[PDB]
Automatic annotation (TrEMBL), chains A, B, C, D:
The keyword Lyase applies. Pfam families: Aldolase_II. One of its GO terms (cellular component) is cytoskeleton. Residues 4-182 form the Class II aldolase/adducin N-terminal domain. Keywords: Lyase, Metal-binding. Belongs to the aldolase class II family. It comes from Alcaligenes faecalis. InterPro entries: Aldolase-II_Adducin_sf, Aldolase_II/adducin_N, Aldolase_II/adducin_N_sf. It comes from the Bacteria. The keyword Lyase applies. This is Aldolase. GO terms for molecular function: actin filament binding; lyase activity; metal ion binding. It is an enzyme of class 4 (lyase).
């Protein structure tokens, strides 16, 4: 169930052009403390199948499945420790969110579909370079705080969801919000943010598990291919 | 016949890249007063088949077909009531039209293919947030007036056609006009509008049912796939 | 053979995202005086097969093949009359060339692949609206002069080649040159043109029939699909 | 082995959208001095198979394989002679890197994935036009110096790798870095470069042969097509 949900999540991120390459990371908190499920080393999101997700501990020992973990995902254990409510984490350097990261520009909530990130997207202004697991773990979990997402300056983004479906939903919506903002600002300059009270209400509406799960299942069907009409 | 046209209309909107999760809506005025045909809840445009369109009433009672309707489409009944000439409605948060909506920028008619929207695209400057069907329908039918289209600030757009073909035609042409304007303004600044007399003549020419229907049938063939040349 | 070249030309324009729709036009000068070969009415470039190209006269009578011609192509006879060297004409409202057209911005030759249009792209500043065949025919052939291409303000472009291969080559290179200029100007402002003497030499190099024909045959193979490596 | 690597490299360049007619070039230094392996004339990267790479000398004599080499690649022998450490060269006029070339804008290292080009991307400000193999070879090897890549003003780019995998990795990363910079600058103006010490460390990390080869093998699998989930 978990591995199948993760495989669909990777195919959705690939379909929506996150172009994660080998810089893409995904994890789901294990029922076993101190452990997490993750895509095995050397594979991209677009090729992930349920058998490519293994269960690993703090020392990168494979507890379940066949394969070796991407050591760059070890820092996810720090986020899971700081946030008991988080059950899934995605990190990519997706094209449009990375434009915001590179220009050191926070997300400005100015449209309905940008509201799942309203008061829910942190911004790490400092780029630590090539990191260590404990260095990145400490830095990201502190900068992220209680938010669902974080733009990592000169790097990419990270989403932290209460389920793999919510982390995927946040990743897709953040990338689309970033694209919308970059295209709008190039043509028209800085955006007028929407009213905070109305944006907080749209945030909770779009983040209802029923809508998150139905949207995830829709995107999952899309990855499998739809036959044209006869 | 109606459901078959609506299925093709959805595949055309999907082909021309209008997805934003499950935000896409389409309806056709039923022959039964006070009722409408619409895509059942949980489905995207790209997967719609004739059997996924059900006839629903003001209380979301499925009168024909199998399924539950998207409750977000209830406001369509207010538009149909205001506009007896309108028989099909499409609402999406398509990528380029949503850039105009987010930047609070009306469409500027400066090119031949933008003319079906000449003096035919309203602009709702106020974003109501998460709406109640009572208020959304009143707000949108009032702002739309007698026009064929409306850009909904911080939200997306809506098209209102005399047929499903015309609503689809207006949707594709609005999205392409918005893309053209955003790309032109990013490189060169504000556009010079074309002469109003010539634009109104091109508007009526491009909106002739023979041209609207032939274009819709062409796009329908495209969605089915074309075999390469041998 | 002529119709097979035209069928491949249409598939190439479709592959390279000219999104010609029903606004796309293509012709080849007939061996019979006062006649031309053209895509029959109601069809897009992406679906054109050799049997869809019919021979037509000044009164739109079908002399060869099955079908009715697009009456909007009648003005091509005026271009053929003004230019005995021209044997093929393509007119589309392709996405990037139409940005230049809409912003009333001539092409600025600043890169190797833009040189086939160096001193070879006219600009019609006046938009005549919905035209008459004699009106458009006289206007375009006079504005085009002895050039291979013309940007038609608020409309699109037209290419005029000594062969169908050259008209196709000019269409693809003009669309790509326009995309390059719009992207460069949005990020960095107005371009510095390359030296005219060196650009005229690159123009003649890239316009050698051997290179035009080999590039056309390459694009033709691409439209047919290439099997992945095993 | 070398021919198979080159075939995959071409399919990767094609997948990552680097086409510009038949302007694409690729070579690998032969084990025989004074000779190189290259894609035979008239073929694009997307259709290359192992049998399309032939070994040729300075006079374009085919020493191995069947076919005629692209004479435009003759200048690659000058780069190989100047740089014993370089074993593969790629030259294309890819869309985004060519925007930087056309606007005479050097790459600004402001993001993690741009670091393989940190202090490793030369800029040739002078455009020589249609060149002789003679002067082109001298001009590009002098401007390239000891770097891995060079932006060629008003032309495109060239990458020079210690292996075909590294040349491919540098091309993909340069094209993506250029896209990121052009999109960021259009919306937000000039970028703030990352710290040089941290960028040099990320440069060496991302350029480790284990990472270069694993990424190349991943992209190779992607070109072959991945079946959707069941
Ligand atoms: Fe990363
Ligand atoms: Fe909506
Ligand atoms: Fe036209
Ligand atoms: Fe070149």
């Amino acid at each position: 169930d978990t591995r199948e949900t993760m495989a669909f999540a990777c195919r959705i991120l690939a379909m929506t052009e996150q172009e994660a390459g080998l810089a893409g990371q995904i994890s789901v908190r294990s029922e076993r403390p101190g452990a997490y499920w993750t895509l095995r080393f050397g594979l991209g999101f677009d090729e992930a199948t349920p058998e490519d997700f293994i269960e690993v501990d703090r020392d990168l020992n494979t507890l379940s499945g066949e394969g070796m973990a991407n050591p760059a995902t070890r820092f996810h254990l720090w986020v899971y420790e700081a946030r008991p409510d988080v059950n899934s984490i995605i990190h990519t350097h997706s094209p449009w969110a990375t434009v915001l990261a590179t220009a050191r520009q926070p997300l400005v909530i100015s449209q309905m579909d940008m509201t799942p990130l309203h008061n829910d997207c942190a911004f790490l202004g400092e780029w630590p370079g090539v990191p260590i697991a404990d260095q990145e773990g400490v830095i990201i979990s502190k900068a992220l705080g209680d938010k669902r997402a974080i733009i990592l300056a000169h790097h990419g983004y990270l989403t932290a969801g209460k389920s793999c479906q919510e982390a995927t939903y946040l990743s897709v919506y953040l990338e689309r919000a970033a694209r919308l903002q970059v295209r709008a600002q190039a043509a028209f300059g800085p955006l007028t943010p929407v009213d905070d009270t109305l944006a907080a209400e749209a945030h909770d509406y779009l983040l209802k598990p029923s809508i998150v799960n139905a949207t995830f299942d829709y995107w999952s069907r899309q990855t499998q291919g739809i036959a044209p009409l006869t």
